[PDB]
Amino acid sequence: ETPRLLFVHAHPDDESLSNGATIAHYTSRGAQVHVVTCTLGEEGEVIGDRWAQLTADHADQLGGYRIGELTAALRALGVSAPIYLGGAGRWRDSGMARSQRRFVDADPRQTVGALVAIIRELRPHVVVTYDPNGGYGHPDHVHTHTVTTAAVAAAGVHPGDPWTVPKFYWTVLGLSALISGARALVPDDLRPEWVLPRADEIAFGYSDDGIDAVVEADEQARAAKVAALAAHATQVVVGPTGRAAALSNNLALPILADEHYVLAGGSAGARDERGWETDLLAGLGFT
Ligand SMILES: [Zn+2]
Numbered sequence: 001e002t003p004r005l006l007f008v009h010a011h012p013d014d015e016s017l018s019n020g021a022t023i024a025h026y027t028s029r030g031a032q033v034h035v036v037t038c039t040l041g042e043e044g045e046v047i048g049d050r051w052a053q054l055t056a057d058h059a060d061q062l063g064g065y066r067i068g069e070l071t072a073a074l075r076a077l078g079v080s081a082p083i084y085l086g087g088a089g090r091w092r093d094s095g096m097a098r099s100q101r102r103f104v105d106a107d108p109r110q111t112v113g114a115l116v117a118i119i120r121e122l123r124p125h126v127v128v129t130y131d132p133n134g135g136y137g138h139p140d141h142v143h144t145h146t147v148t149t150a151a152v153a154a155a156g157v158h159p160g161d162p163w164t165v166p167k168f169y170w171t172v173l174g175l176s177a178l179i180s181g182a183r184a185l186v187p188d189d190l191r192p193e194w195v196l197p198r199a200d201e202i203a204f205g206y207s208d209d210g211i212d213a214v215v216e217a218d219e220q221a222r223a224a225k226v227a228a229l230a231a232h233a234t235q236v237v238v239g240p241t242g243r244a245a246a247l248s249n250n251l252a253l254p255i256l257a258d259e260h261y262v263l264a265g266g267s268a269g270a271r272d273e274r275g276w277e278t279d280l281l282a283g284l285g286f287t
Helices: 014-028 062-076 108-122 139-156 175-184 219-231
Strands: 004-009 032-037 126-130 167-172 213-216 244-246 252-254 258-265
Touching (some): 014 032, 014 219, 014 258, 032 108, 108 139, 126 139, 175 252
Parallel strands (some): 004 032, 126 167
Antiparallel strands (some): 167 258
């Protein structure tokens, strides 16, 4: 069949920050790729003045605005539309700017059930989400991991026909890639106010030995990631060469074409000399 991949993320922007080049790699090769976003990003902050009054401290309309940002970003990556877990607006994120519908406080029967329904409908060959620490500990990222882990297990056996996801991966930050990438930046790649952080300010990184797979995307796919990040204008600032970006904290990272993964469930396919698979579909018999 045509391969089917599912990426499950907490907020609008995370899909591009983490998996933009992988998503673009697979959609350009004709795979069916879907992104599930668990919240609208209602509690986000905004870069710049134009949309400053949309945040939760003023009009509290930022999540609605971010639907268009996500849609634009997904389109840049070859994905036709967003999917919000439980429907757009079901569960609210926990951000910087009281709620009776916060995703972290949600009834697990409802969040796991929603995701299980998605997995059983789509029948993905691959599911991707955060590691157990959510990347850098954001409560919504940790909860997405919890919900997704539970959904993958339960989707095998809720209504519908059981589907055992062939390969379940965690998206992680590759330390050696980030270091190499950062070393390759030049001052032209950064805005004056940016600083290159040490890895521990932005993520719980992984050594080469703790990584199972890499998707080493081409320049077309990296450019699609750059465009996707640009679409999230309230959240990300892309640098002048499209080689680095920063969030509102001014901590700049390289926009790399290589994305790394830990195989959490399933059997690996053929690994390269680093001991890494080079295709999330490895071993599944796709030509
Ligand atoms: Zn996030």
